[PDB]
Amino acid sequence: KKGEWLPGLASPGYLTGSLPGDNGFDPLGLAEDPENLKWFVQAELVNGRWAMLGVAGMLLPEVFTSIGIINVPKWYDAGKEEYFASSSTLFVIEFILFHYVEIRRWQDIKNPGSVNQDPIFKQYSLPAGEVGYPGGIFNPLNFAPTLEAKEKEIANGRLAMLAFLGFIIQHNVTGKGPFDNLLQHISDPWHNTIVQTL
Amino acid sequence: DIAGLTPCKDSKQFAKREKQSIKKLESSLKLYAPDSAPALAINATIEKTKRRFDNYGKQGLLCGADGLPHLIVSGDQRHWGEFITPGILFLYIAGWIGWVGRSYLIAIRDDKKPTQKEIIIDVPLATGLVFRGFSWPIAAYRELLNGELVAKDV
Amino acid sequence: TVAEPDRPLWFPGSTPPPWLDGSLPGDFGFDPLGLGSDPESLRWNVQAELVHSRWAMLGAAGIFIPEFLTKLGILNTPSWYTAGEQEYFTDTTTLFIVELVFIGWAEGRRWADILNPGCVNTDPIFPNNKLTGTDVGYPGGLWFDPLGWGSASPQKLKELRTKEIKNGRLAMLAVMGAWFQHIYTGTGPIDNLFAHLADPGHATIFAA
Amino acid sequence: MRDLKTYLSVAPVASTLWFAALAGLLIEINRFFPDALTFPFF
Ligand code: CLA
Ligand SMILES: CC(/C=C/C=C(C)/C=C/[C@@]12O[C@]1(C)C[C@@H](O)CC2(C)C)=C\C=C\C=C(C)\C=C\C=C(C)\C=C\[C@@]12O[C@]1(C)C[C@@H](O)CC2(C)C
Ligand SMILES: CC(/C=C/C=C(C)/C=C/[C@@]12O[C@]1(C)C[C@@H](O)CC2(C)C)=C\C=C\C=C(C)\C=C\C=C(C)\C=C\[C@@]12O[C@]1(C)C[C@@H](O)CC2(C)C
Ligand SMILES: CC1=C(/C=C/C(C)=C/C=CC(/C)=C/C=C/C=C(C)\C=C\C=C(C)\C=C\C2=C(C)CCCC2(C)C)C(C)(C)CCC1
């Protein structure tokens, strides 16, 4: 039992259950090629991690301000609030920093193990891990990278990506934050749904 | 505005043409009975014309001295709805069609008599293949990078 | 399977088609167009007929018993034909969508079983339930067969299934007749029955 | 039935059915959103 996305359907051959979260879901056959699968697994990892962080950032502040602890704006309108630096300055700083770190990650992906070493202090190299899972300084608490935990990470990331899609579509169609939508639906579920929204 | 044109909403010849079109349509209506099928059809057409002109004014199209909408395709972000996002949509659909057809041709190329599956379409296989065009933008990209989109040795 | 060369036929004196050898419950050799010749298509059509029969029996009951019940002053179900617009506790669209997801789940389970027999009999939440039925189209189990009336010898189950399919065909024709009557006339099926019984010689199709 | 399916998938018949379906789809899309000269949604 590798997990079946359709009980009555067999899983694709190129999927063998080795990868965490492998439930045999790939109707479009996007991973017929081992290299394509190897690239897409990393794509999924990074997309899921970013999605989890983003959905947390959009959700937790909203509920916290709704219950009355902090007074943050909504995620969609948070762009206008003036910060200590100009928006363009922040964007360019972020661009430089990410242009460095993401290229480091890319070099790791292309040929594993070539960028485990600190480029300034010749000591302090990362432990020889696996692509997409660089331990060492990135894992201070040193939680075991057990396979079951990897599956939990993958599942939570997929849920977060679905949630972000919902966040943006709900904001586009309704015009407010997700938590307000949930609260309104809870107030009267039988007259507050997509049908009445549309 | 761009190219010396003016917005259709505040243009005058556009409004004159709108009025003239409605007047022409109404001219026929007065001949029939007030509430007959031809009269209802003509009224529906008049309402359609009014809605069309109002929508054209609403979207912010540009009107020339002729009073007709003109499409800007230079790339101005104020007019991406005129050619660029429809262009992207067309490219997506056309690549869908071409990729699906190419996938079918490659799939049936291994039989002893491939021509038989070309004049008599193997629908079972085609129904499975047609859905690859949802993600053809990725399949073709990785097909090119992997270097097997283009037939080498040729 | 028990092939009955000498079963009663839909058209006495004519040989039934080769692909209809009496294996299926309620086989009378009726296939003029020969639609079910292909074995896989034959199985698919058998499943289609079974599901159509069950749906139509439910519909015939829920269209006729309630109206035979409101014709007599017992309760007040409205006309079935126009019963779709009388507003309930919520709008029709939300009910349609919530009903759609549930029935889609059920029909997906059924589809998975049809195209892969005996591959979904276990409950995905508590894998100690297991539908007992071992035949496609006959799930059985504690849910769809709590009484276990039809688990005995195959011969008994054969004629019980024949009873099922015959009642289903009758129900299908009944529901279609109710629809065609309400569109042709402007009254209810029980009204039509009562009027025709009052005047069996003149209250018929040829009254318009 | 099997031969009916085979002939029903031959080039001319399949093409006519495909193009009838495409024509109907485009006709309905135009009917719901007629006189559309731009993409205003985004
Ligand atoms: C399936 C059983 C069945 C039964 C018992 C009835 C019974 C009745 N129908 Mg009806 N009908 C049916 C099916 C049925 N119909 C079907 C499937 C259709 C769609 C074509 C119609 C369409 C229909 C219309 C448009 C009308 C009736 C009318 C009537 C009533 C007067 C008969 C008449 O003049 O119309 C003649 C009906 C037909 C020629 C079609 C019937 C043919 C089917 C195949 C049934 C054959 C009977 C079957 C072999 C034996 C039944 C078993 C048992 C009940 C005896 C009557 C009480 C009339 C009415 O409302 O009364 C004023 C009327 O206007 N029916
Ligand atoms: C990256 C991501 C989200 C990141 C969000 C971020 C950073 C948000 C940041 C901010 O919010 C903060 C924190 C604060 C706010 O004030 C400001 C912003 C700036 C807004 C989501 C990805 C989200 C990605 C999504 C939703 C992807 C969905 C993919 C699907 C459904 C694919 C399914 C299949 O592909 C399979 C698996 C198999 C194939 O064969 C078949 C198909 C069916 C194609
Ligand atoms: C008659 C029918 C089909 C007839 C098919 C025939 C004769 C085919 C015959 C042949 O093919 C064979 C066998 C052999 C071939 O070689 C030759 C031919 C000759 C081609 C299907 C009906 C099948 C009928 C079905 C499935 C109907 C179910 C309807 C329901 C449940 C309705 C429910 C209600 O909605 C209402 C209408 C009103 C609401 O207010 C309340 C509720 C109760 C909700
Ligand atoms: C932006 C724009 C513009 C312009 C542009 C230009 C001028 C450019 C370009 C361009 C180019 C310069 C291009 C090119 C190309 C080349 C090549 C070389 C290619 C290719 C491809 C291919 C080959 C493909 C294939 C396929 C597909 C993918 C689809 C389907 C299938 C097949 C297989 C067919 C303008 C201003 C007008 C307007 C606005 C927009």
CB B79 within 8 A of CB B72: yes
Closest CA to C169 of C61, C19, C30, C54: C54
Q: If residue B61 lies in a helix (H) or strand (E), which one and from where to where?
A: none
CA nearest D40 in B: which residue? B81
Nearest CA to ligand 3 atom 25: C56
Instruction: Read off the DSSP letter of residue A126.
Output: P
Atom index in ligand 1 nearest the CA of residue C176 equals 17
Q: How far is CA B44 from the centre of its chain?
A: 24
Amino acid at C179: W
- Which CATH number describes the domain made up of A34-187? 1.10.3460.10
**Spatial distance between the Cα atoms of B53 and C53, rounded to a whole number of angstroms:** 54
**Spatial distance between the Cα atoms of B91 and B137, rounded to a whole number of angstroms:** 10
3-state DSSP call for residue A127?
Answer: coil
Q: What separation in angstroms does the CA of A178 have from each of A106, A168, A172?
A: 34, 9, 11
Q: If residue D13 lies in a helix (H) or strand (E), which one and from where to where?
A: helix D11-32
Q: Structure tokens of C174?
A: 């009944």
Q: Look-up: residue for tokens 């969609």? A: A76
Ligand nearest to the CA of C207: 1
Residues A117-142: b if buried by 16+ CB within 10 A, e if exposed:
eeeeeeeeebeebebbebeeeeeeee
CB A152 within 8 A of CB A50: no
Query: B70: which strand partners?
Result: B62
**Spatial distance between the Cα atoms of B150 and C26, rounded to a whole number of angstroms:** 58
Q: Is residue C10 part of a domain?
A: no
**Spatial distance between the Cα atoms of A18 and A11, rounded to a whole number of angstroms:** 13
Number of domains in chain D: 1
Q: What separation in angstroms does the CA of B30 have from each of B16, B18, B25, B34?
A: 21, 19, 10, 8
Nearest CA to ligand 4 atom 30: B98
Structural domain boundaries enclosing B53: 1-154
Closest CA to C45 of C54, C37, C36: C36
The answer to whether residue A39 neighbours chain B at the CB level (below 8 Å) is yes
Give me the count of residues in chain A.
198
**Spatial distance between the Cα atoms of B5 and B64, rounded to a whole number of angstroms:** 5
Q: Structure tokens of C104?
A: 């889609």
Q: Structure tokens of B39?
A: 């009269």
**Spatial distance between the Cα atoms of A16 and A10, rounded to a whole number of angstroms:** 12
Q: Show contacts of A88-96: CB within 8 Å, 24+ apart.
A: none
Number of domains in chain C: 1
Query: B62: which strand partners?
Result: B7, B70
Q: Which of A27, A30, A33 sits opposite B146 (nearest CB)?
A: A33
In the reported structure, the alpha carbon of residue A103 is separated from the centroid of ligand 3 by a whole-number distance in angstroms of: 64
Number of domains in chain B: 1
Cα dihedral: C148, C153, C154, C158 (round 10): -70
CB B132 within 8 A of CB B99: yes
Give me the count of residues in chain C.
208
Q: What separation in angstroms does the CA of A107 have from each of A87, A131, C168?
A: 30, 10, 67
Q: Is residue C108 part of a domain?
A: yes
**Spatial distance between the Cα atoms of C41 and C36, rounded to a whole number of angstroms:** 6
Q: Structure tokens of A106?
A: 């890319």
H helix runs in chain A, sequence order: 34-67, 87-110, 147-173, 178-187, 194-197
Sign of CA dihedral B102, B104, B110, B113: negative
Nominal resolution (angstroms): 2.7
Q: Helices H, strands E: what count in chain C?
A: 5, 0
CA nearest A194 in C: which residue? C94
φ, ψ for residue C115, nearest 5 deg = -85, -5
CB B60 within 8 A of CB B1: no
Report the greatest alpha carbon distance in chain B.
Answer: 76
For the beta sheet containing B62-63, the strands, ordered from the edge strand earlier in sequence to the opposite edge, are: B6-7, B62-63, B69-70
CB C58 within 8 A of CB C50: no
Close Cβ partners of A75 (under 8 Å, ≥ 6 residues apart): A57, A58, A61, A62, A167, A171, A177
**Spatial distance between the Cα atoms of A170 and A64, rounded to a whole number of angstroms:** 20
- Deposited experimental method: cryo-EM
β-pairing, B69-70 vs B6-7, is unpaired
Instruction: Read off the DSSP letter of residue C26.
Output: T
Question: What is the Cβ-side half-sphere exposure of residue A112, based on CA atoms within 13 angstroms?
Answer: 11
Structural domain boundaries enclosing C93: 39-198
CA-based angle A117:A121:A124, to the nearest 5?
50
Strand locations in B8-151 (E): 62-63, 69-70
CA-based angle B12:B16:B19, to the nearest 5?
140
**Spatial distance between the Cα atoms of C49 and C165, rounded to a whole number of angstroms:** 8
φ, ψ for residue A52, nearest 5 deg = -60, -50
Chains touching chain D, criterion 3+ CB pairs below 8 Å: B, C
The answer to whether residue A27 neighbours chain B at the CB level (below 8 Å) is yes
Instruction: Read off the DSSP letter of residue C42.
Output: H
